[PDB]
Amino acid sequence: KEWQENKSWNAHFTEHKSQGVVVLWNENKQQGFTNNLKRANQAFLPASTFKIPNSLIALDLGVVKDEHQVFKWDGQTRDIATWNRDHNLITAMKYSVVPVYQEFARQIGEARMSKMLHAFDYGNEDISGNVDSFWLDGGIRISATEQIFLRKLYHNKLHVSERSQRIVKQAMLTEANGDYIIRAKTGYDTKIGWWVGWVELDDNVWFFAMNMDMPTSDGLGLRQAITKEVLKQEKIIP
Template sequence: MPELTHVTRFVLALLLCLAPLSGSTAEVEKRPDIGRHFDAAGTQGTIVVRDVSADSTIVHNRTRAETGFLPTSTFKIPASLVALETGIVQDAHNDVLKWDGVEWIVPACNTDQTLATALVRSCVPIFAVLGKRIGDKRLNAYLADFDYGNHDATGSYPYWLEGNLRISALEQIAFLGRLRRNDLPISPDHMQTVRDILVTEEGDGYVMRAKTGWATSPEPEIGWVVGWVERGDNAYLFALNVDILKPEHIAARLDIAKAVLKDLGALP
């Protein structure tokens, strides 16, 4: 019986991993030409783009897309949701989160913040404090409810940069899809607040919502950019991670993602 339970769990985990690609009518398309954007930047990685209206998903480097990595600062999306849902932060735009006076590598973080500014500026010290206030047990319960990666916010702290938490590009897409369509088990108002904060770019007929991330602890270093583009009634979810082999690759994260989104018609 224990063996059967183990197999059952394995099968369920596999199905959950493949869910973003395997809906009843979903189509998966391989686009080898997308690799040229990684090649041009001199790095390697993966990108997953889901066209919601077409019910299709495009994957570059499927093996890597299924591999869990540290979420880095993309974790600040679920962390913000939990901070609001638990009441640790009541107002994302007005509650003051005090600076501890310790100089951080991001100058904009060396002052008092709100949740909104801390998320936009990716202030690790602020989210480290919020994480401690939430507590690992409560946070892990929310991550399980969100089906966020391996749900394992444990180990070295901050666990999204050094600990045991891992998430794949496919799992990022699944989580973002639930956030976009108000399908997470928390207040719709809190989801709307975080969606609004994530807006990074607006143009003629489109809105981009995104969050970047970067961790220096693995070898090689890892960089993320995740989010979605809204165009009329359609949306294109995307999740990219790359190896950060040189300083230029920090900016290349978003450059590659936007180039691929343009190729696919998600961006003008």
């Protein structure tokens, strides 16, 4: 009753010769839905969805002063054109600028990063590996249901200031029109791709967390596209 399985959504993954899970949470009804109950609770690397807690920690420790502070390009020409420029928290989130967040993580340091993830109840709370890459290739793991962390963020219940939480929710802003607002973050670890966040409507909020097998970055647009198809199927968005 609290959780309900809907395998019809599998078609949206197999339509694209893929495999994955979408988890939805209806906040007003306190009811969850997914196409795959097992996979909804399997833990994966968070990859760049880790930018959500990393941002909160950087803000609350004063590593980042506000969303306007500029992190200047380090002058290394990288493969992603939008990384080769100055950023602030907003644009760094938007373009998933790993080198900016690696600098945050080094400033934060291991002892504080670990304490804060413990305080967040975030995934397996394990930062084994490099302090500035463990969310990409170290020991940290989180499941889709565990990402649905987001409910605490939404309600300002995380163990960081309300201000830090409002700034990160602002930075997560992805889309808005007269029908809905999406606040979310993508991630990709070269094997699975993520999209996690929520959809704000006039009278409700739907939290989502999706991950999918993702051999190639050619199909990264499928993270949003598959998720939106489910949302349209469920009459959450038009």
